[PDB]
Structure 1
């Protein structure tokens, strides 16, 4: 109802460039329109009308990236995303982002991520811890996009290892699940995992039985979505105890799951398999982590107490150092008496 907004929450699946304020997106559009680099009306149209089906969504990202791939803008949206999550009482955020190259502006994967760090340093409206009045803990995941080559994925992994000193804790594989081959990414993800980086994989967003099995056989630390798992995939997932990042609004909008009332998050909850409610792209899908909790609470008929326990259970699914997980345990214990 309202307590959901004040519930302390852990966000483990938020893509930076999918988490942008509507007003920031259109302001950036209007300036590039007035600079004559795009045609505002067309861009405004696609932000408005793109149906956010899995096919259309990747087109919308191509558009966003034309608006947002500049150092000053990366800093700006990093700051705004952290403020927005902190303001709805997210107390721990793993923020994922694909590092970009853009030669025309001398942007490298490293200089892109330096702009992210500058964003974190610029956070002022809330207290931030991003390496060891609202307080938020922020840690970073570098995304590998399924359009990338093995060597490009390796550059991302090497950059992640170098940036462990500013809160990088893991690697994601994401982007269009119709593009690329697991065999391209497996070798870079193996190098990451062997160098003690934590790994989350987008898995089963489309039917792909051999890819789902190969991602499960890799034993990543988390998976996202799991929309087109078959019974053989659930049995292996449950045996391997790999937590699932559940993206309720995302999965309904993209037509990946036909309704909340058949969503697998209820089978997992009942089976006592770890799951974490996530926004995925709260900008693209017009939601908030409080709203994700609201949709789950009504669908499962959870009490305040059951809902609190589910939120707290996310702590051991974080990629944070033990010190931070201990701080989160303190934060949850302090709030427990307020949740029936």
Structure 2
């Protein structure tokens, strides 16, 4: 069961860098910061331990994580570790998304934060990596706009993404607390990104919000994430616009955004032949792996090995990679296909 799924080549399209941290790394960072007196280690260890990861509590957890991880050398470390972890379960293509941070007291700009991410990619040595333009993994980057930001700070992220297209930035995400901010703040920056040929993925429908869901669909992003609280008119529009959905099974169940895997919309989308991609979202926060997500889907839908492999391969055309990378991915999958029957 889990062994063949672990061996399947897989494509990860929705993984937030600071949601993908090893527990042992987070606790080590906390210990060091406590020895310096920045935090009380026992309280921090407690929140990492006890936060029930309901939707409200998840964003409190991210505020704590960011207190532990926002410095250049830590960004470099966790970038390398996340790439290693995905490569070890035979992710062959990763779009890693992260919110560039500004931290004036340590001389960190959004640009230097992203330069520390690039340094993390350059530091990968346990696997072979392709990110510009023994397992091998292709990595491309999405820069996240957090819904707490302003239009002008969102525009700084978009401008930075355009400047970093040579080191594998391919797109922009809108994410962060779905209870905060207005679509009208971010639509103008996302439109600038889209008009400059960046690919766009939007977190959409994480909470009930009918006007915002319709407005995000009308923008015609290249992908959306989650789609938990769509109504029928939203599904009809989504299916007509053919926007792929990044499906986050464990996340949606843990946050109580979806009552159970057996009603999760990924099954309706699968049966309607609508593009979907199984994703981890935050494999550290939610204690999962991409192989575990596939295992949940495979059990729930009763997929054969051939159907599972076909679903995994279908994610290629939803990537934001250059066409040459997609051609390489088609070669990788077609070459592995006979082993998954």
Whether TM-score is above 0.5 comes out as yes
Q: 5+ unaligned residues in a row in structure 2: which ranges?
A: none
Q: TM-score, normalised on structure 1?
A: 1.00
* Unaligned segments of structure 1, at least 5 residues: none
CA distance in 1, matches of 2:88, 2:104: 36
2:223 paired residue number: 222
Cα shift at 1:2? 1.1
Look up the SS of the partner of 1:186 in the other structure.
helix
RMSD (Å), alpha carbons: 0.3
Residue in structure 2 matched with residue 201 of structure 1 by the alignment: 202
Write out per-residue CA displacement over residues 261-297 of structure 1, whole angstroms, 9 at most, x where no aligned residue. 0000000000000000000000000000000000000
Runs of 4+ in 1 over 4 A off after TM superposition: none
- Per-residue CA distance 1:296-326 (angstroms, 9 max, x = gap): 0000000000000000000000000000000
Partner deviation per Cα, 1:177-235 (whole Å, 9 max, x = no partner): 00000000000000000000000000000000000000000000000000000000000
Q: Distance in 1 between matches of 2:196 and 2:97?
A: 19
Q: Distance in 2 between matches of 1:316 and 1:119?
A: 27
Tell me the residue number matched to 1:128: 129
2:65 and 2:38 map into 1 onto residues whose CA distance is: 14
- Equivalent residue for 2:18? 17
The question of whether the paired residues in 1 share the 8 Å contact of 2:92 and 2:137 is answered with yes
Cα shift at 1:131: 1.4
State the Cα deviation string for residues 108-148 of structure 1 (Å, max 9, x = none).
Answer: 00000000000000000000000141000000000000000
Answer whether contact 2:244 2:275 (CA < 8 A) is retained: yes
Distance 1:26 1:132 in 2: 35
Q: CA separation in 2, counterparts of 1:33 and 1:132?
A: 40
Quick check: 2:266–2:276 contact (8 Å CA) kept in 1?
yes
Could you tell me how far apart the structure 1 residues matched to 2:3 and 2:33 are? 39
State the 1:336 CA deviation. Answer: 0.3
CA contact (8 A) 2:133 2:165 kept: no
In structure 2, distance between residues paired with 1:37 and 1:270? 51
Distance 1:264 1:247 in 2: 11
Secondary structure of 2:229's counterpart equals coil
Aligned: 1:276 with 2:277: yes
Q: Structure 1: how far apart are the matches of 2:109 and 2:221?
A: 27
